[PDB]
């Protein structure tokens, strides 16, 4: 009796939705990030007694991250020089250095500053960047010129994994979960909210993701559970295994005129030839794979687990690809994954050979190519491995077989936007109460 309609504003209730998100970061470097000016400082409050649903495979902000990264790369490559005039027929024999087979690069003609004069030049290229022309094998051509135009990366604009904070707009709240054993789906009984995510580093790599975060408990294995026929299984390490890489030779940059644009070739290689390579702590890798197998055979309880190297595909998936400095690597990982397990502290080091190439197809897409200018001198690099991008083979009939993959770049950032979720606040709500309004 005497219960009347009443309305409340500022109510704590929300509904899930999708919306635009803001780029945020610290003071901008290099005079992947383009958003200025901002100074974020997020604060996290535990929503006591709040049970909320989550899903990593369905949320939209991963797609926003993907589009933002692609657009930023496009804007970075927009002012840089196009390498169209280089498409002419190269005449190559390449017998100068001690090792001719390793690089196998050419001499070609180019129109100089005066458009009526053509000048002969020559430069060094890896034959991964060059494809033989039909007929006489001395003729050669750039790999991607018959499919697309190649843009040289601007040398001063050296983008890198700068951390990025993704800030919600007004009226939306980025939720978060820190349940110690959350597998990417189902409710979280331990929820919180923030303005801005942590600093996500837009790293690009294949067969495993590095410079990542680390889980709370032991190694976490994340997968889609609509069907056993999964595309990719993400494994997140709780204990980083350090990886080191180097390019010992001393390379010599050289400039070729194109107006004021200059094309940066590899003029000469200084120092005796040594193939690029990397190092891994053998005992750590052994223990990590053993722990991963022990965790993984919970899901698949009555079968052996065997690790074997990838099969087929481009260099981006047949080998571990990444970049350190202004160079790209492609390291043969066959020795690492060749293991098997029964169904029932840096003592030694593994070494893996590696190859580097300059003309990079834009990882997600073909028909648009990047050319990396050569980094002079010698390079060393160190990074922290933090997860594996596995993918299983079906139809094996009582023997599981997980082999590395992950050519699709989106899976990398679906692991680091793993916690978060965005909701829309519904501040207005009604209820019954005792009332009167004067008349």
């Amino acid at each position: 009796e005497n219960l009347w309609v009443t309305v409340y504003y500022g109510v704590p209730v929300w509904k899930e939705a999708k919306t635009t998100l803001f780029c945020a970061s610290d003071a901008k470097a290099y005079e992947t990030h383009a958003c200025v000016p901002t100074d974020p400082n997020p604060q996290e409050m535990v929503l006591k007694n709040v049970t909320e649903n989550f899903n990593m495979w369905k949320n939209d902000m991963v797609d926003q991250m993907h589009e933002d990264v692609i657009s930023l790369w496009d804007q970075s490559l927009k002012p840089c020089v196009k390498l169209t005039p280089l498409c002419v027929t190269l005449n190559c024999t390449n017998a100068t250095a001690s090792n001719s087979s390793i690089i196998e690069g050419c001499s070609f003609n180019i129109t100089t500053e005066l458009r009526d004069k053509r000048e002969k030049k020559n430069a060094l290229f890896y034959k991964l960047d060059i494809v033989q022309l039909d007929g006489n094998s001395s003729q050669y051509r750039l790999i991607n010129c018959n499919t697309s135009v190649i843009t040289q990366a601007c040398p001063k604009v050296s983008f890198d994994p700068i951390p990025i904070h993704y800030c919600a707009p007004a009226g939306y709240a980025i939720l978060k979960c820190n349940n110690k054993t959350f597998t990417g789906t189902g409710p979280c009984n331990n929820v919180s909210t923030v303005q801005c995510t942590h600093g996500i580093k837009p790293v690009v790599s294949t067969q495993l993701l590095l410079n990542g975060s680390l889980a709370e408990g032991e190694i976490i294995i994340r997968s889609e559970n609509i069907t056993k026929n999964v595309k990719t299984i993400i494994v997140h390490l709780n204990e980083s295994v350090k990886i080191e890489c180097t390019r010992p030779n001393n390379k010599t940059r050289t400039s070729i005129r194109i107006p004021g644009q200059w094309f940066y070739a590899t003029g000469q290689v200084i120092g005796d030839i040594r193939e690029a390579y990397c190092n891994i702590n053998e005992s750590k890798w052994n223990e990590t794979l053993q722990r991963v197998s022990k965790k993984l055979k919970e899901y698949f309880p009555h079968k052996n687990i065997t690790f074997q190297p990838s099969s087929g595909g481009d260099l981006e998936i047949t080998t571990h690809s990444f970049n350190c400095g202004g160079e790209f690597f492609y390291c043969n990982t066959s020795s690492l994954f060749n293991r098997t397990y029964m169904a029932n502290n840096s003592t030694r080091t593994i070494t893996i050979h590696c190859r580097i190439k300059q003309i990079i197809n834009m990882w997600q897409e073909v028909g648009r190519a990047m050319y990396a200018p050569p980094i002079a001198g010698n390079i060393t690099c160190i990074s922290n491995i933090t997860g594996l991008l596995l993918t299983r083979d079906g139809g094996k009939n009582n023997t599981e077989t997980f082999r590395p993959g992950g050519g699709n770049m989106k899976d990398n950032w679906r692991s680091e936007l793993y916690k978060y979720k965005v909701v829309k606040i519904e501040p207005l709500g009604v209820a019954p109460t005792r009332c009167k309004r004067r008349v």
Partner: nanobody
Amino acid sequence: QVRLAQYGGGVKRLGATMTLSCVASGYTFNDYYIHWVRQAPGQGFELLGYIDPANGRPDYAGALRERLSFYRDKSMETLYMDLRSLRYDDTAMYYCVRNVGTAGSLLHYDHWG
């Protein structure tokens, strides 16, 4: 709209290598996995393997891993498969079929070639 044309066929001599082909058309080439199923006469359908068109990752049935080989050509939106050392019981009609792949899993074929 979408059409998966095919070429190659006829008679292939015993023990010789053979190479079919496929051509995509009215859809985004990277977003849909491709499979290769075959039907011998007097048998139900069976799957050989599937090839991811974007990165080119293949995967084969257990009994035919040595003989098969899948590869594509992104610029032409073309796919292939080679079956080395044909045996007599390879007599069959080989369909290429699209797959409706979700964000993290694979599901029913829709558009057969």
